[PDB]
């Protein structure tokens, strides 16, 4: 009849500066061990419910799907205004964002050319590019960001970029390069007081460069498309925009808004490719640790796909072992350990407790991905987790990398497709190696960030013959 049990928000002088997973995990584990699978922790004076393990998470996201279908909130984590929710002042801006997001999402699933085909084309170009390395040790970060990003570029501009095209490299840099922001508590307060909120990284110097060349490219590309536009046959998304602009008679202010909102949406699409990239990077790090598994996968590729044709999405149905391996990669990859926050849409009764309407809830996906109740070896790579006695693919309750229920990842489809095609196409044409012996491969993620990302590592792709 009350909120789940948990620690008190007090004392206030109890260091409101929690900043690190190595210590947040320690705290998380302690709380779960003491209060159970469902507890409440406070962010400032804000109650946040935490769900642990496969059972609790599915009972909420699935069994009471509607109740737990509310969107999470963006809360201040700093000691000042700690816990306060932050929102856009104009509710319409938000609704417009959701609208364009969905519309654009629908448009990308259209066209004569399928996404699978573009991913195959990209996989082909990746193979060729890797060959040029003649097996030298390299950091696959740039190329893995490149292959997922190029799919969006292909869809938008009509064709992919060459990996070394300056515009493309500046684009990858704009979205994924880390930059340093220098400021004091006082200077940040002063900015807000002056009416400015600069949240994203990049000083004039840093970003003005990339951005300037990028805009020029977009400008002229929109120009070329317009000069050769065929209303009967839209080639790509730029055409779709030009056509869906016919009779868009609106003042400069409103025109600006429509245009910039599209760019903002495309930006989110680009950022989203990072989850797939990271999963691929984690996957290959894992393959380095298990050379024999990698070989089995290559063997299955040989049996089903052969070596005279590129892998196709429908080949996955006949490749249970590789499928199982990819599942393990996502499971152990554990990209979003804490899950994405939700809110209950009404006072909700859950396992004897009452979660007030609008309360934030975190389904800790990591605690499910490593659930000893459903995975025989929760902390060890094991394809058996998804295979029956006859080696056929089988599902596992603990597997929920894309989350579950009504808010399940809208991109799970394209992500799975890219994972499969990139993973199999690469291993079909290459074997991999590292100075670091298998038994010494460390799967520990970077200490920074909210998600799990493999730290930089060296790997070599040996062309097969």
Ligand X SMILES: OC[C@H]1O[C@H](O[C@H]2[C@H](O)[C@@H](O)[C@H](OCCCCCC3CCCCC3)O[C@@H]2CO)[C@H](O)[C@@H](O)[C@@H]1O
Ligand Y SMILES: c1ccc(-c2ccc([C@H](c3ccccc3)n3ccnc3)cc2)cc1
Residues annotated in a binding site for heme = 409
User: Residue 443 in contact with residue 267, Cβ under 8 Å?
Assistant: no
Number of residues that bind ligand Y (CB under 6 A): 32
Give a three-class secondary structure readout of 201-246.
CCCHHHHHHHHHHHHHHHHHHHHHHHHCCCCCCCCCHHHHHHHCCC
Identified binder of ligand HEM from the candidate list 102, 410, 450, 463, rule CB under 6 A:
410
Q: Residues 303-332 vs ligand HEM: string with x where CB under 6 A?
A: ------------------------------
- 41: contact with ligand Y by CB under 6 A: yes
Q: Identify the DSSP state of 450.
A: S
With respect to ligand Y, which residue has the nearer C-beta, 18 or 456? 18
Of residues 195-234, which lie at the interface with ligand Y (CB under 6 A)? 211, 214
- 198: contact with ligand X by CB under 6 A: no
d(CA 243, CA 298): 46
CB of 451 to ligand X, least distance (A): 12
d(CA 319, CA 323): 6
CB of 407 to ligand Y, least distance (A): 11
User: Residue 242 in contact with residue 229, Cβ under 8 Å?
Assistant: yes
Of residues 233-262, which lie at the interface with ligand Y (CB under 6 A)? 260
Quick one: tokens of 86?
């932050």
Identified binder of ligand Y from the candidate list 409, 433, 441, 462, rule CB under 6 A:
409
- Which of 422, 446, 434 minimizes the C-alpha distance to 148? 422
- Which of 388, 382, 356 minimizes the C-alpha distance to 370? 382
- 335: contact with ligand HEM by CB under 6 A: yes
- 150: contact with ligand HEM by CB under 6 A: no
Q: Which residue is nearest to ligand X (CB)?
A: 91
The annotation places the binding site at 409
d(CA 311, CA 113): 17
Number of residues that bind ligand X (CB under 6 A): 41
With respect to ligand Y, which residue has the nearer C-beta, 150 or 348? 150
- Which of 333, 330, 396, 401 minimizes the C-alpha distance to 365? 401
User: Residue 111 in contact with residue 236, Cβ under 8 Å?
Assistant: yes
Of residues 249-288, which lie at the interface with ligand HEM (CB under 6 A)? 269, 272, 275-276, 279
- 3: contact with ligand X by CB under 6 A: no
Identified binder of ligand X from the candidate list 3, 7, 77, 381, rule CB under 6 A:
7
- Residue whose token pair is 């498309």: 225
Backbone angles phi, psi at 353, to 5 degrees: -110, 170
Identified binder of ligand HEM from the candidate list 64, 403, 429, 452, rule CB under 6 A:
403
- 50: contact with ligand X by CB under 6 A: yes
- 71: contact with ligand X by CB under 6 A: yes
Residues with Cβ within 8 Å of 429's Cβ and at least 6 positions away in sequence, in order, are 127, 130, 463, 464
- 369: contact with ligand Y by CB under 6 A: no
Quick one: tokens of 39?
């507890």
- 272: contact with ligand Y by CB under 6 A: yes
Identified binder of ligand Y from the candidate list 13, 19, 182, 197, rule CB under 6 A:
19
User: Residue 272 in contact with residue 413, Cβ under 8 Å?
Assistant: no
User: Residue 258 in contact with residue 250, Cβ under 8 Å?
Assistant: yes
Residues that bind ligand Y (CB under 6 A): 18-19, 21, 24, 41-43, 48, 77, 101, 153, 156, 171, 174, 211, 214, 260, 263-269, 271-272, 274-275, 338, 409, 411, 450
């Amino acid at each position: 009849g009350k909120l789940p049990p948990g620690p008190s928000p007090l004392p206030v002088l109890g260091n409101l500066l929690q900043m690190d997973r190595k210590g947040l995990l320690r705290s998380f584990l302690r709380l779960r061990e003491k209060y159970g699978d469902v507890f409440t922790v406070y962010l400032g004076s804000r109650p946040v419910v935490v769900l642990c393990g496969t059972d609790a998470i599915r009972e909420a996201l699935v069994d009471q799907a509607e109740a737990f279908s509310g969107r999470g909130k963006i809360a201040v984590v700093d000691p000042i205004f700690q816990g306060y929710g932050v929102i856009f002042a104009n509710g319409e801006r938000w609704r417009a964002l959701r609208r364009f997001s969905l519309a654009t999402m629908r448009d990308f699933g259209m066209g004569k050319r399928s996404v699978e085909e573009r991913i195959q084309e990209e996989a082909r170009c990746l193979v060729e590019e890797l060959r040029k390395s003649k097996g030298a040790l390299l950091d696959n970060t740039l190329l893995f960001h490149s292959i997922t990003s190029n799919i969006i570029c292909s869809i938008v501009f009509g064709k992919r970029f060459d990996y070394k095209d300056p515009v493309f490299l500046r684009l990858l840099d704009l979205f994924f390069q880390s930059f340093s922001l220098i400021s004091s508590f006082s200077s940040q307060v002063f900015e807000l007081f002056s009416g400015f909120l600069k949240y994203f990284p990049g000083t004039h110097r840093q970003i003005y460069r990339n951005l300037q060349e990028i805009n020029t490219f977009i400008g002229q590309s929109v120009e070329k498309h317009r000069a050769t536009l065929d209303p009967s046959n839209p080639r790509d998304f730029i055409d779709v925009y030009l056509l869906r602009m016919e009779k868009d008679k609106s003042d400069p202010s409103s025109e600006f808004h429509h245009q910039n909102l599209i760019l903002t949406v495309l930006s989110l699409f680009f950022a989203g490719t990072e989850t797939t990239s990271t999963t691929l990077r984690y996957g290959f790090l894992l393959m380095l640790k298990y050379p024999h598994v990698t070989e089995r996968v290559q063997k299955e590729i040989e049996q089903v796909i052969g070596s005279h044709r590129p892998p196709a999405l429908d080949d996955r149905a006949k490749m249970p072992y590789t499928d199982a391996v990819i599942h393990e990669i996502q499971r152990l990859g554990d990209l979003i350990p804490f899950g994405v926050p939700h809110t209950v849409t009404k006072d909700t009764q859950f396992r004897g407790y009452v979660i007030p309407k609008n309360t934030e809830v975190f389904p800790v996906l990591s605690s499910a991905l490593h659930d000893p109740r459903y995975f025989e070896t929760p902390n060890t790579f094991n394809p058996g987790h998804f295979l029956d006695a006859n080696g056929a693919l089988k599902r596992n309750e603990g597997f929920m990398p894309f989350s579950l229920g009504k808010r399940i990842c809208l991109g799970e489809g394209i992500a799975r497709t890219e994972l499969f095609l990139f993973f199999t196409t690469i291993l079909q044409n290459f074997s991999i190696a590292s100075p670091v012996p298998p038994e010494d491969i460390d799967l520990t993620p970077r200490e920074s960030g909210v998600g799990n990302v493999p730290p930089s590592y060296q790997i070599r792709f040996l062309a097969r013959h």
